[PDB]
Amino acid sequence: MKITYIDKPTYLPSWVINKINEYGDFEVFYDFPNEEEAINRLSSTDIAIVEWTSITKEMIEKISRLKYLITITTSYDYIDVNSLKDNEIMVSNCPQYSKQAVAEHVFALLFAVNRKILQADETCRKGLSHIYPPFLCSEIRDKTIGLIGIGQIGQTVAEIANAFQMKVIGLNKSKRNVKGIQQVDITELMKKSDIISLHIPRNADTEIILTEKLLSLMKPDAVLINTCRGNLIDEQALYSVLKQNRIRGAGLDDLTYYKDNPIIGLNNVVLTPGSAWYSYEAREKNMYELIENIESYLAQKPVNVIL
Amino acid sequence: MKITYIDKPTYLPSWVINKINEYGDFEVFYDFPNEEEAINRLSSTDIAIVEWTSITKEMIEKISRLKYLITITTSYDYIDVNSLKDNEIMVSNCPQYSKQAVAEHVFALLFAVNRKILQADETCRKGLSHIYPPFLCSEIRDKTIGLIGIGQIGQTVAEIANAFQMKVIGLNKSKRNVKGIQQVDITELMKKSDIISLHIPRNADTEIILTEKLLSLMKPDAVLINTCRGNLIDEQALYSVLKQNRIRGAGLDDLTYYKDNPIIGLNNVVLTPGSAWYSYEAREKNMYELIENIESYLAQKPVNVIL
Ligand SMILES: NC(=O)c1ccc[n+]([C@@H]2O[C@H](COP(=O)([O-])OP(=O)(O)OC[C@H]3O[C@@H](n4cnc5c(N)ncnc54)[C@H](OP(=O)(O)O)[C@@H]3O)[C@@H](O)[C@H]2O)c1
Ligand SMILES: NC(=O)c1ccc[n+]([C@@H]2O[C@H](COP(=O)([O-])OP(=O)(O)OC[C@H]3O[C@@H](n4cnc5c(N)ncnc54)[C@H](OP(=O)(O)O)[C@@H]3O)[C@@H](O)[C@H]2O)c1
Ligand SMILES: NC(=[NH2+])NCCC[C@@H](N)C(=O)O
Ligand SMILES: NC(=[NH2+])NCCC[C@@H](N)C(=O)O
């Protein structure tokens, strides 16, 4: 039994390295493998752990030995899970470690946009005080927040919202009834929400789910929050919406690209570099989930299986 | 009956101008009077409304005619209410208009400090993605927040802290019990709080309530929030705490002074220019309190009376 963390871990403390070596031969690579290194590392192990590296169907056809792949992430959009299924390789993610961290980040971003924290701080650094007109804001209490995706993270955001005394609406794919969330279609969500937050995986179905048309339905003072992939939005259309001040602002933890992206020029966005998840509590839970995946698989009762 | 708003109103919309003109002659000065002009304006009116101008005992003893002074603010630390009472001038404030806006600003500041929003946004503007280590944060869920002052605004903060499922401790002067808040003395509050937030008026008793000694008791990762007057804190001692990184950071909506204040040079503070209160909802409620004050005085049963 060989277990391999095939690319550079953000967090992998000594106690976890020691624990995983109790289960088998554990090897960790502190780099980003090229495609050939990735195939070789995947083919030299029985369980693999991945954080950064795309695993494509073309790669999986060249893989041998590997039986179990764990994404350290909740997302698995960079892994061809269907191709792994077709090659009898089981896949698990780490499904809940970050949900509180990300839900709190939604409110961090929402408040940073609403209160224009970037401009407000810069005003004070200029030595100006008691400046109100540029910072006229809306209270979030009693506003409508619309959650596109109401799973682990969406439901955590709803809990915080519902006790901020907000109206929570939302949508999912299965139409399973989620408690405390009035479920609507996406057109109504875009029309009625004061705040819109995305909590949905990226795949072929959800890419560019926020079309130019749907974005044009937003309220004139709406705030859009994205702690998910930038590819979920027509990003060029979002730029035009913000550039033309057709909504209040956006808080974005991901963009489809960064260098020379015109959104970087906007004074009504707040950007974070994918840091929504990274709390002390989340990264520790991430380790507990990784270890639970390994133990449960060795017990022949695997958990968090992606199917 | 003559009513005068003696200095520049931040907000005085059409419906308020029209309503106050029903009671008599309404004059508004869209400027900032000096002391002599303030005395003259106050002495040339029956009811006065004030927003910016200090009204000292020396001025009050020179005033005639005036019977009722309304501060548009909740604070009245710039008005000598004792001298007003001794000269048989009634005084009211506007006591609740901003409590939701300020309570939400506490969390806007808390999250801005905790998630290092200023630095995170700057990282993205430099074109960098997936930068985690500098932004390692604590979730605020299950943390202890200590509220110095648990009146109108403090209790609103306490309600939001329960929304995030935090432990709330606090103190007041009367030691009257407040439900949902575990009351402690200030030494215990400074020692046990992960987040400290001030919600206390500025007066002879509360100035520099946060001493150098009390500030030295703070937890190494504590976050201090001040939406009240900067003079509640030994500000030089606070600078020393932050400069030496003895706590995580501070979110400050006021400073004792701004020009060349060394706090402006700190990378672990988030500053807002007194903008905590300024929501659409708050300024509208401010007008309804102004009207209720005027009408109550006209009915010879004044409300919101100071002292
Ligand atoms: N920024 C960060 O640091 C960070 C950290 C972790 C995760 N994330 C992102 O957050 C995403 C969500 O995580 P989660 O744990 O909340 O996922 P989850 O529990 O799987 O929930 C996903 C939600 O999206 C819904 N959904 C899926 N496909 C849909 C479609 N085509 N149309 C409408 N709704 C659809 C699901 O509906 P059903 O229940 O009906 O299937 C469910 O309500 C992840 O995929 C990841 O990309 C970001
Ligand atoms: N940043 C902004 O834009 C903004 C906007 C509005 C207000 N404010 C500030 O917020 C302050 C508080 O407003 P509020 O409406 O919450 O006031 P409030 O309802 O009068 O509450 C004041 C609280 O402070 C307590 N307190 C008074 N003196 C004290 C002392 N010496 N030691 C300990 N506790 C003491 C009171 O306790 P007892 O009940 O036992 O007396 C009460 O719990 C205002 O004075 C104002 O300066 C700021
Ligand atoms: N956990 C970790 N080492 N990386 C964070 C990844 C965040 C988000 N994409 C996700 O979890 O899907
Ligand atoms: N409401 C108004 N025009 N000014 C806001 C003043 C905020 C705070 N000092 C207070 O109300 O005490």
CA distance A303 to A294: 9
State residue B164 phi and psi, 5-degree precision.
-80, 0
What one-character DSSP code corresponds to residue A263?
A: G
Instruction: Give the distance (Å) from ligand 4 centre to CA of residue A113.
Output: 22
Which residue in A has a C-alpha nearest to residue B101's C-alpha? Answer: A139
A185, A213 Cβ separation under 8 angstroms: no
Chain B residues in contact with A129 by the CB 8 A cut-off are 254-255, 258, 273-274
How many angstroms away from the CA of A5 is the closest CA of chain B?
Answer: 19
B120 and B241 in a single domain? The answer is yes
Q: At which residue do the structure tokens 């008005």 appear?
A: B79
Atom 5 of ligand 4, residue of closest alpha carbon: B73
CA distance B232 to B200: 8
Q: What CATH number is attached to the domain comprising A271?
A: 3.40.50.720
Distances (CA, A) of A42 to A67, A71, A89, A293, B131: 9, 13, 11, 17, 26
B168 and B227 in a single domain? The answer is yes
A140 touches chain B (CB under 8 A): yes
A90, A302 Cβ separation under 8 angstroms: yes
- A10/B279 Cβ within 8 A: no
A27 and A66 in a single domain? The answer is yes
A96 lines ligand 3 (CB under 6 A): no
Instruction: Give the distance (Å) from ligand 2 centre to CA of residue B151.
Output: 6
Tell me, what amino acid is at A299? A
Q: Which helix (H) or strand (E) holds A20?
A: helix A14-23
CA distance B136 to B117: 12
User: In this structure, which long-range contacts are made by residues B8-12, counting pairs with CB atoms below 8 Å and at least 24 apart in sequence?
Assistant: B8/B32, B8/B51, B8/B52, B9/B49, B9/B51, B9/B72, B10/A132, B10/A133, B10/B51, B10/B72, B10/B278, B10/B283, B11/B283, B11/B286, B11/B287, B12/B287
Q: At which residue do the structure tokens 């029903």 appear?
A: B22
User: In this structure, which long-range contacts are made by residues A71-77, counting pairs with CB atoms below 8 Å and at least 24 apart in sequence?
Assistant: A72/A5, A72/A9, A72/A10, A72/A286, A72/A290, A74/A98, A74/A152, A75/A201, A75/A202, A75/A229, A76/A201, A76/A306, A77/A201, A77/A202, A77/A203, A77/A229
B204 touches chain A (CB under 8 A): no
Which residue in B has a C-alpha nearest to residue A125's C-alpha? Answer: B264
- B105/A138 Cβ within 8 A: no
**A14 Cβ contact list (under 8 Å, min separation 6):** none
The radius of gyration of chain A's CA atoms, rounded to the nearest angstrom, is 21
B55, B69 Cβ separation under 8 angstroms: yes
**B150 Cβ contact list (under 8 Å, min separation 6):** B158, B170, B171, B172, B178, B181, B183, B199
- A160/B132 Cβ within 8 A: no
The 10 Å Cβ neighbour count of residue A180 is 12
B282 lines ligand 2 (CB under 6 A): no
Question: Six-digit token pair at A69?
Answer: 């792949």
Question: Six-digit token pair at B248?
Answer: 């995580």
Nearest alpha carbon to residue B245 among B142, B113, B141: B113
User: Rounded to the nearest 10 degrees, how much is the dihedral formed by the CA atoms of B226, B227, B228, B229?
Assistant: 80
A280 and A200 in a single domain? The answer is no
CA distance B252 to B270: 6
A52 and A168 in a single domain? The answer is no
Name the residue among A111, A135, A273 with its Cβ closest to that of B131: A273
Q: At which residue do the structure tokens 């899970």 appear?
A: A81
B35 and B171 in a single domain? The answer is no
B260 and B176 in a single domain? The answer is yes
Domain count, chain A: 2
B116 and B198 in a single domain? The answer is yes
A116 and A255 in a single domain? The answer is yes
B247, B218 Cβ separation under 8 angstroms: yes
A1 and A139 in a single domain? The answer is no
Nearest alpha carbon to residue A155 among A96, A233, A195: A96
Question: Six-digit token pair at A167?
Answer: 């109206």
B262 and B127 in a single domain? The answer is yes
CA distance A186 to A146: 9
SS (H, E, C) chain B: CEEEECCCCCCCCHHHHHHHCCCCEEEECCCCCCHHHHHHHHHCCCEEEECCCCECHHHHCCCCCCCEEEECCCCCCCECHHHHHHCCCEEECCCCCCHHHHHHHHHHHHHHHHCCHHHHHHHHHCCCCCCCHHHCECCCCCCEEEEECCCHHHHHHHHHHHHCCCEEEEECCCCCCCCCCEECCHHHHHHHCCEEEECCCCCCCCCCCECHHHHCCCCCCCEEEECCCHHHECHHHHHHHHHCCCCCEEEECCCCCCCCCHHHHCCCEEECCCCCCCEHHHHHHHHHHHHHHHHHHHCCCCCCECC
B242, B250 Cβ separation under 8 angstroms: yes
What one-character DSSP code corresponds to residue A44?
A: T
Instruction: Give the distance (Å) from ligand 2 centre to CA of residue B262.
Output: 27
Q: Which helix (H) or strand (E) holds A191?
A: helix A186-192
A115 touches chain B (CB under 8 A): yes
The 10 Å Cβ neighbour count of residue A163 is 15
The answer for A 205-224 residues in CB contact with B (under 8 A) is none
Nearest alpha carbon to residue A20 among A278, A295, A304: A295
CA distance A8 to B65: 77
Q: How is A167-185 classified by DSSP, letter by letter?
A: EEEEE-SS----TT-EE--
Chain A residues in contact with B280 by the CB 8 A cut-off are 136-139
A85, A240 Cβ separation under 8 angstroms: no
Tell me, what amino acid is at B171? L
How many angstroms away from the CA of A297 is the closest CA of chain B?
Answer: 29
Largest CA distance in chain B: 66
- B273/A139 Cβ within 8 A: no
Question: CA geometry: angle at A233 spanning A228 and A175, to 5°?
Answer: 70
Q: Is A301 exposed, middle or buried (0-12, 13-18, 19+ CB in 10 A)?
A: exposed
CA distance B88 to A254: 62
User: Rounded to the nearest 10 degrees, how much is the dihedral formed by the CA atoms of A238, A242, A243, A246?
Assistant: 110
With the C-alpha atoms ordered A124, A126, A132, A134, is the resulting torsion angle positive or negative?
negative
B148 and B265 in a single domain? The answer is yes
Q: What share of chain A is helix, strand, coil (3-state, %, to 5)?
A: 35, 15, 45
Structural domain of residue A221, as residue ranges? 97-275
Name the residue among B127, B132, B141 with its Cβ closest to that of A10: B132
Method: X-ray
The 10 Å Cβ neighbour count of residue B122 is 14
Q: How is A135-164 classified by DSSP, letter by letter?
A: G-B---TT-EEEEE--SHHHHHHHHHHHHT
| Residue whose CB lies within 8 A of the most ligand 2 atoms, among B173, B200, B208, for a mutation test | B200
Q: Is A37 exposed, middle or buried (0-12, 13-18, 19+ CB in 10 A)?
A: middle
